[PDB]
């Protein structure tokens, strides 16, 4: 079983996890129409996916110049990691969706709107999540079973998703991404605080697991933001999400490259979705 | 609303709480037969008690030379404190039961057996608790909504209840009571640890809020026991039961007397029954 650590450390997946696992989850290519026109995404279903069961769902965004296919391409191979981790019992089965911020009027920053209105209702009406319906009320009532993350520009997307979508999403994984508000780290922090206040949520209802590499240029802006967030009452700093809600993993020597960032996901994603989960688990 | 503090301090109820509250809960005198013959207890029902609702239940034991009527007599007046705290919103409504360790073969130490077999089934078949039935399975499945405490010899009773009844009871309030096992504080601690291990429970499924006065002779044996318990992995020391599960409140200058001990209860009882509660509360 999984056990929460209070300060989890960078730990890459074994080399063999980058290769195909014979217990492969199905990746389905989907096309949908929304406020930024006709676009595509991929949905990863866990091996043994049973549509009579309910699954947590994690949405994960690519970086600049990439697209909805990148994360599951040979350039990244995240599905192989997911497959092997799920078969070995390190990660509880979940749906992982890779959308895009390209197309139409869409930008990494404004994607949250298409996410709220088109992406969630499209995905979660077809696949089996904890959403009982895809009205605003049904999405909001299943928020504990929904997560959002992304790398670089997709990291930035994640931040704008948290500030605009706390009603719909409880778990956030910004990977090497800055957030732009005011002109100081404190102003960034305070914008996030004000979003949390408007939401009415308690400290046990939102969770942030950020990460980057110590040789990734994103560290320069992320670290002061994280420090300013630590000062806020809204966040209790620890990776033990049974006790707190905010952690920053820094991989020593890691650069701004999917080859490393895929391992952040391997490290952080097993920490998601246990709070108020419907299983009886000791973590 | 109530908010958890990480190190709650001794704070007596206002003087006016010792007087009758016009929103008085009903105290019902009950007689039952069990393994120690025919005996009595009192059941305190909260003001507005609705038998269509479910209530948490706290069992509370008297000291040496006292009886099932003592805690709700003029010598103690706990019901007035309960009444006023419940009317002012400081304590969520609950059933409080005062049994006795007198009669038959019963002793403060061996009461746990009569408690398991006769007291719980008698009380919880008549009054409205979270127990869906009073078989061993129905009691065990409602354990998160059951608590046990007591003063002096009743404190000792509480300890023997924890070591024998973790399957039935999640919250424990030993007040000025020692536990006897081995001849060192570590041996006491290790006996409690071994009981927790046999139960299969996690750290989020049992809670201990101990207390005494700094001028109460019980402090002499309680404090080394508590220290030895702190060292165990089984217990995370803090009164914030959303994060940990073990606290020791020491009232400075307080003596071995109900006049003080009733205030420990006022302080500690609002901390009980919130973990995995069926209400939507921010604490």
Author numbering:
A (entry chain A), B (entry chain A): 803 to 1085
Give excerpts from the publication.
The RoboDiff forms the core of the services offered on the ESRF beamline MASSIF-1 and, thus far, has been used to mount, characterize and collect diffraction data from over 20 000 samples since September 2014. In all three cases diffraction images were indexed and integrated using XDS and reduced using AIMLESS.
